[PDB]
């Protein structure tokens, strides 16, 4: 369940970095 | 946010388990090889039996996913201590129901039990992803992650159990499953990117990738053996997927037209909005018979695209007078894949807990 939350959290960072 | 389609999602059913009478084989192996009292590990055998019974009747929630991962790992721990694989001394029959035919399939191989549990892990994640209404950002992100976990389970199964034990776990069917789950994860991410009001070019690229995943699933669904095995499931899935191909292509070109608008490319804006409207019109034709959830998403999107196209063409015809490019002269939208099968480690002590059979050596 801790691995799951990290994947959820990564989604915010993925879009921020992609959007630039 | 009203810009979110909230289309329904596909999920996979869990397979039904039959018998796996491992206890007598473990007891015989302990006495024959390890030379010990064959009753010395009854407490361990009871723990694994209770875990199996919980795993084959798994609660449809996040806790159920942890049950399946735990049981999957304990099966690896057992196989490392007692040889129960194909042709090995302690192998016993393992029976599971093949889900599309409903017929029982038996193998004298503990890795068959592992494969089915791993399949059901992917199926359960797909159910949990599909169950959410995706009204909130959190619901979108949690569903996205469930679909990535589902793809990860099916991908791990495909790679590490490469000889199919049953036709519902064949390489080509598992590839269909991975592509469908990745398409659905990417669709959930698209909804979040529209809820977040991200830049139009990013929304366009994310939606173009939804299309690419669904095109790959659609090709797999047209395979004659897949179609014959899935039967009417293939017809149902293909209708939804084919509709979503055109819907998310429309969304991609809608957002390319918005990027054109932002750059004052008013002739290019007309071309993308026209393309978006044509794609949406095809999605509507392909959506005949679909539930009102689908029809409402199409209807709300038609409000947006139909009005923007008419306004854009009127503005260009009478104000800006820019050339309208032919569709083939523009650079296609390249997908932005931002989802992946999430890696699985079946023997991670964090998910398995302590090894039930640690005393057996």
Numbering used by the authors:
A (entry chain B): 2 to 21
B (entry chain A): 1 to 361
Sentences from the paper on this structure:
His domain protein tyrosine phosphatase (HD-PTP/PTPN23) is a tumor suppressor that regulates mitogenic receptor downregulation, endocytic recycling, and cell migration (Chen et al., 2012, Doyotte et al., 2008, Kharitidi et al., 2015, Lee et al., 2007, Ma et al., 2015, Manteghi et al., 2016). A central feature of HD-PTP function is the ability of its Bro1 domain to recruit CHMP4, the major subunit of the ESCRT-III membrane remodeling protein complex (Doyotte et al., 2008, Ichioka et al., 2007, Parkinson et al., 2015). Crystallographic structures of the HD-PTPBro1 domain in complex with the relevant binding regions of SARA, endofin, and all three human CHMP4 isoforms reveal that SARA and endofin binding is similar to that of CHMP4 at the conserved site, but critically extends into a neighboring specific pocket unique to HD-PTP. Altogether, this study identifies the Bro1 domain of HD-PTP as a highly selective interaction hub that coordinates recruitment of endosomal signaling adaptors versus MVB sorting and receptor degradation.
We then demonstrated by biosensor binding experiments that the first 22 residues of endofin, bound to HD-PTPBro1 and HD-PTPBro1-CC with similar high affinity (dissociation constant KD 3.1 ± 0.1 μM and 2.7 ± 0.1 μM, respectively), suggesting that the endofin binding site is in the Bro1 domain of HD-PTP. As predicted, the 22-mer SARA/endofin peptides form amphipathic α helices in their complexes with HD-PTPBro1. They occupy a larger binding site than the CHMP4 peptides, partially overlapping with the common site across H5, H6, and H7, but extending further into the S site between H3 and H5. The SARA/endofin-HD-PTPBro1 binding interface is largely hydrophobic and involves residues F5, A9/V9, L12, L16, and F19 present in both peptides. Leu16 accommodates itself into the second hydrophobic pocket and interacts with L202/I206 in the endofin-HD-PTPBro1 complex and I206 in the SARA-HD-PTPBro1 complex, consistent with the importance of these residues for SARA/endofin binding to HD-PTP. The crystal structures explain the impaired binding to HD-PTPBro1 shown by L15P and L15E mutants of endofin. L15 forms hydrophobic interactions with L338 at the proline-rich C-terminal region of HD-PTPBro1. Substitution by Glu would disrupt these interactions and also clash with L338, whereas substitution by Pro may cause a disruption of the helical structure and potentially result in the loss of several interactions at either side. Another key interaction in the S site is the hydrogen bond between the hydroxyl group of Y4 in SARA/endofin and D348 in HD-PTPBro1. Indeed, a shorter endofin peptide lacking 1-MDSYF-5 showed poor binding (>1.5 mM) to HD-PTPBro1 or HD-PTPBro1-CC, confirming the importance of the Y4 and F5 interactions.
